[PDB]
Amino acid sequence: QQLYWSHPRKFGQGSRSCRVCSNRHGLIRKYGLNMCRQCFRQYAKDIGFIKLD
């Protein structure tokens, strides 16, 4: 019963995940974005990040 989710999920790309896609590879951790780099590009402009050069 209790061992269902009993493995320490404190750290590492197991634990942390995206705030959209929820996949766990290419998390833009910086500035606490925490989205899939794909997701990042998808929302960039709305988030405010903007390609100047």
Partner: protein
């Protein structure tokens, strides 16, 4: 009419008080943000609402791993029958506009 009563029936009351309800699509949340009277986790919430929808007593919108549950008129009626509540009641939709 399912599983632990106290938990379920506390959900159903929360679904009446606010018209709406949200979760976070996340099984392993031994609390639930809001509610949080006693354990009553995310899920139990999540799987009750999913029944509600299935028998046609609440609508949906997903958006960014979360869940949102706008509640139907047919849904409201079902809860007031289930919670054996009065015909006046006021769920949430009342609010003075101007």
């Amino acid at each position: 009419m399912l599983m632990p009563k106290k938990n379920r029936i506390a959900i159903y009351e929360l679904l009446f008080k606010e018209g709406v309800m949200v979760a976070k699509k996340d099984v392993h949340m031994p609390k639930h943000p809001e509610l949080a009277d006693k354990n009553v986790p995310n899920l139990h919430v999540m799987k009750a609402m999913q029944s509600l929808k299935s028998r046609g007593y609440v609508k949906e919108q997903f958006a960014w791993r979360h869940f949102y549950w706008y509640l139907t008129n047919e849904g409201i009626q079902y809860l007031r029958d289930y919670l054996h509540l009065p015909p006046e009641i006021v769920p949430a939709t009342l609010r003075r506009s101007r």
